[PDB]
Symmetry: C5
Subunit: 347 residues, 5 copies
């Protein structure tokens, strides 16, 4: 994730201009190779047309250029591209919102699972760790960066997310499908045991715990579903073919013909085709942003910080349910006990 | 479902190009026959115009070609097609999200329905199987693949989803409508009986069970409603007629006329009309993807894996509520008990 | 409702072509009269221009035709039409989703309202019938077909939805507004009485009953709000005027002028204007589908089957809460007690 | 609100044509003055060009007309207008859905707050009246019509919504912000008191009451937020300037020039510019509908019936919680105790 | 926030015209500098072309102008700009809806945390202050204005949001991530303590408190996520580059060439290019509104009133939970105890 929210807090005079200088997570970083290749094939064609083809070959190439120029517009680049990009962006935001977080569960566990002794500490820490382990399992299933960090379940064990006994239970389970849900069932069983033992003092607290756990597990399952149900490959292939075919047609009809032939719209020979290069920049950049966002769990600069989120969630959950449990400051009267650096339209 | 999420994890140099080689779940597989037929009727027309029609017939055909070329654009292909495809894609994703899953119910049942003896096992397994049977009944009602797998209720009985006594109760029910809801009523009655018998220890647990069951049954009912309330047939007919009429008009006005006649925009005779074939490819591919996604429960390559989901859900639910019930690893201190391979914009 | 989901289960070679033959719920059925009238006024104008007007009148009519042809495009038909159709389709789906269904309530009542005797039967049946009666009252308020089926409250009484005593209570209520909510208040009072009498064994069950009843009543109220708050009449008038004015301008400028005058773009006299008739077909069909969907509770072929839904809901609710109450099959071990005809991208 | 849902129940032959005759809540009523002014300035310009300007001035005006005609299209009227209208319509529907209604609260209060004596009547009536008073306070804050009906809190007191003692408590509260939330806090305190006194028999009932009250108060707060957070004034100014500038450019380039000068596209002098007047009608009508819907609580014909809703809500809530409390008809066997005027695609 | 809802309550004759005069939160205020710079570079180019370039240089500049005029349209300004603006506006409204408010929590605390003595006052005030402190911490993390108001945690302490002991606990927590969640864990612990001590009389009340607290904390976390996950920088860079490149191309091809050369479409030399300046106004205004809304927590005129909201929330929460606790007016019969200044379409 490349963050620039603070730089755009106010609409200043040079508001978005100062963001053009950034390289990390930039359009240039994602598209400079493609732009260079496009310019290379254009100049190769230009050099051929200028210093290779004969007069008759030149005339035929000019006729072909003028045709490819007037019909290359039959390729519905904008229509398919816009549909595809909108779909990808909606999926991108939904996928980010589907990443599990323990904050709700950690608050519920701090307020519901009781005991200052070692057993209560164990209960709270184990519940938070079960949630974190479900998150880690799903993320390594769906995230290339997380999988590179946890290439095996042994890595998960060595990171403190899974114990050795828990690893034995996890492996001995006879299932051919992803087992990310297993820690959620462990969480449900442990919450039931805590309620039975009296650590959870009321049935409503257990129901709230189970509801929050179901929300968390549903987020993990949504992550799994988004990973499994990709954007239909037909749309990806169609958009890629549309971009490639349109830019090939532009490579031929964006050629600058000899002005001496008197062709209409061919009087100025700039040599380098700026507007095609700008048009290629914009359209190929749209497609490249779609490629980056299509799987937001890879290792792109603007992809999600899944490992950072894992570490933050684990640390914060442990802090909240272990160190800050029953550790309030004595009730003290606030500043305004005795009391800077709109009502309505009709009023 | 054809999955390619891992191949697109990072926006690489040849990012989407490597996906053009796939055949299964591809645009080529869905559209090669239609493209071949379109090219066949175009060349038939071209051969007729070239070697059959007389000079006067050729002149008249050229006039007709130039007219069909300048007005074929009055057919609002893009407008209707975009509206239709957006509607279909939204329905496709909603329908996928409407497929019932037992994960929430299985977690609740593992944490709420108690007993290590055979009776508790029976309760948990029967509840999970009632949920799975509701899912199977609705899916065979709405999915052609599932129906082919379960052509009769006897097949459902032989798969272990329904017992013989349950089959007798199911058939003896005097109803002329789909009975997918019957297992949900069985689930409610069995949950009430378990609560009465003490297997469910508190009323809040029963309420949570009923809420999760209602979520599951609502997903099944949404599947039924999506199956029943098709996309309005008027839109389907209009889009199909628009595509057919536009491509017939293109079959006549995309003809390459004899350049010797001096018609404007007719100087290069390529023989094969690439841009029309590319335009046909893109628009007909849009429509074909809409056809594939309109019923995502068929047997298209990119359709949902309903049978795989059925098997996975059954296996996972049985595992969670039978083998992993009250089977936790003893509470063990984690790695960080005593403690790799952003704060805000204003900060 | 015209259903064709099964015919489109797989994207076959002639996928959507086989749907063009359907008449019921078709574009032809909705638009053939309008198309015939449009063609009639066009040919009347054509016959006048061909065999009535003099040479000078013909020249003036040709000038008028060429003007109406180049400016008729200033009417933003596509823009307003697309906005209107999107609004109408979104409202159509939301309205369908707002139709109350007793499935959730029937499951809750089967699992919560107890008693195998006649009193428990009466409680369950009366609650389900109160829900059904609220649905019927709202539907006859908003649905022309339902009102034709229940033109008076006496018809509701004779259908078994309302009793005579309930009819007296309903009529004696001093209210000038729609009373569809009255059965919901009756349901709340009856649920409270059942809880007090012990038929509902716990307060959580009563809370769940009330929550489901509130969901049902909210769906009925949403139906009422959709019926009351129509799509703004300004948009309807604007879209209708846009279509009418554009097609009148086309009736004059889509005329085929005498080719002997040498007007540009007027060399081929087809007599029947196909592309205008196709353009009229598509745009007027869009508008006609909007008209059909604007009130989905009328008696159009593709409108909702409100009466079928009423009958199905009543029958299913009665079955679930009367015949299937406490009528489970004895707990039997399933097939797989002792155990056909993906994990992640990073894996 | 102008309702025409019944007139459009079925897609008849003259479906939307019969709605063009309506005046109330019509496009003509909202736009006839603007159309008259536009036509007045056009004819003033036409009369000047025809009978005032000299030959040289006429030639210069013709050159200016032909320029303003070919570039007036650089003003992105459709783009900004469509974005703005979509935003406004979405906000319009959301605002309507944000209007509080007591139906859920009234059902909960009828089923949960008990007592046939005067004290129970007082409790139920006071709770319903607190909800209604919160609605009234927010509406008079945000609705010009409601404020005209309740220009002062004394008017609220005299309407029976607030008592004199409640008015003293309301005024003595030291707050500089809108106090619409005060009746919600009164409702919470009164519900707590009723639960303590035994009128509410269980804690779950109190929780349900508080949840419904929070839903109601959230709707009131959403009304307040929509009133406060207007559509960004930048968008309003931009759209207004775009419409004004485009129609001024049309006022100059939609002029009909003397055909004797031989200007291309200027052969027919109609005098009155129909297509510009139709284009002005459509675009200015779009903008005027946006103006009407931007604040749906004013006194436009199609604005919400806030006062009618206030009266209906108060009357219905009082009826439900006072007259229909514990007033059920004796449980009677229905018509079908002993038992008119689809299953699935795969089946 | 600039509010104009009351001025647009009714669609008056000069409805939106009277809003063009506003300066604060206006398009002029945001765009006058950019418009002045654009006009400056255009006139510099115009003066160069008029009084510097020679005849041959003038001819070459005219050829370059006519090219940049016909191809500057290959830059997809509208497409990318519309996508970007829609994304930004959706995020803007979602971010506003994500701002935490204590109204629900304050109602729950008033109705659930009991005691007229000093201890109950302390409990209620401390809970409301914990919610307010979480809001303040998140806002100063994400809002530049709030951070300027609270540049350090010492400022938070001196504002009464945090006590000195609470500050010590907050700082002693070993965490490298944003601690806005810490007051939420304090709230959960304090609610648990209040329930244990008997201030909260039932477990359902505690569950409701925890649910409302989780809603509040989720809103704060959504604020954090929106601040962190900016709109992808690739889209920002692409839109900025598109606008800059299009307007540079317009700066060259919007030049007015010498009419004596007989270039087509160059007969009238206005000197100042109005339509380009209007087109620049509209497109750059779209982009500038996007810049303003991209971070709605800055100090733009139309940005959110975060400090006002903080003050209002604190004051209202304190009032509701301290002064209005158990301070109802005695139950009094209303005006209509003994009883101004639609039913359905089928009816
Ligand atoms: N004929 C041409 C038209 C346009 C361009 C270009 O701007 O790239 C190049 C050549
Ligand atoms: N006249 C023609 C115009 C275009 C095409 C084509 O690209 O297919 C073919 C013929
Ligand atoms: N001049 C005309 C242009 C088009 C049409 C038509 O296709 O209907 C008819 C006449
Ligand atoms: N030159 C003109 C072009 C169009 C119109 C018009 O239709 O209003 C008027 C004049
Ligand atoms: N050739 C030109 C075309 C248009 C404009 C303009 O309206 O700004 C200026 C010059
Ligand atoms: Ca990626
Ligand atoms: Ca299909
Ligand atoms: Ca209809
Ligand atoms: Ca208004
Ligand atoms: Ca800003
Ligand atoms: Cl609950």
């Amino acid at each position: 994730t490349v963050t620039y929210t603070a730089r755009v807090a106010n609409a200043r005079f040079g508001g978005f201009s100062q963001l053009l200088l950034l390289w990390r997570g930039s359009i240039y970083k994602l598209l400079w190779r493609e732009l260079l290749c496009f310019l290379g094939f254009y100049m190769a064609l230009s050099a051929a047309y200028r210093f290779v083809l004969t007069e008759g070959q030149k005339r035929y190439f000019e006729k072909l250029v003028i045709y490819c120029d007037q019909y290359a517009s039959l390729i519905p680049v904008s229509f398919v591209l816009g549909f595809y990009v909108t779909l990808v962006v909606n999926r991108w935001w939904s996928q980010y919102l589907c990443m599990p977080l323990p904050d709700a569960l950690m608050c519920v566990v701090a307020g519901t699972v009781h005991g200052r002794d070692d057993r209560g500490r164990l209960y709270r820490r184990t519940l938070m760790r079960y949630a974190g382990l479900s998150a880690v399992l799903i993320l390594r299933s769906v995230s290339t960066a997380v999988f590179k960090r946890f290439p095996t379940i042994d890595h998960v064990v060595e990171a403190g997310f899974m114990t050795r006994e828990e690893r034995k239970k996890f492996e001995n389970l006879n299932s051919s499908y992803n087992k990310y849900w297993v820690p959620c069932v462990w969480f449900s069983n442990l919450a039931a045991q805590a309620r039975r033992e009296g650590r959870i003092r009321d049935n409503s607290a257990l129901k709230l715990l189970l509801e929050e756990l179901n929300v968390f597990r549903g987020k993990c399952g949504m992550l799994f579903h988004y990973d499994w149900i990709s954007v239909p490959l037909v749309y990806t292939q169609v958009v890629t073919i549309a971009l490639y075919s349109y830019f090939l047609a532009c490579l031929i009809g964006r050629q600058f013909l000899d002005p001496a032939q008197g062709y209409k719209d061919h009087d100025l020979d700039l040599c380098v085709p700026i507007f095609t290069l700008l048009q290629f920049f914009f359209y190929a950049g749209w497609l490249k942003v779609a490629e980056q966002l299509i799987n937001p769990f890879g290792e792109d600069d603007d992809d999600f910080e899944t490992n950072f989120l894992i570490d933050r969630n684990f640390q914060v959950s442990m802090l909240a349910v272990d160190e800050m449990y029953d550790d309030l400051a004595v009730l003290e009267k606030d500043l305004y006990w005795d009391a800077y650096t709109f009502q309505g339209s009709t009023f």
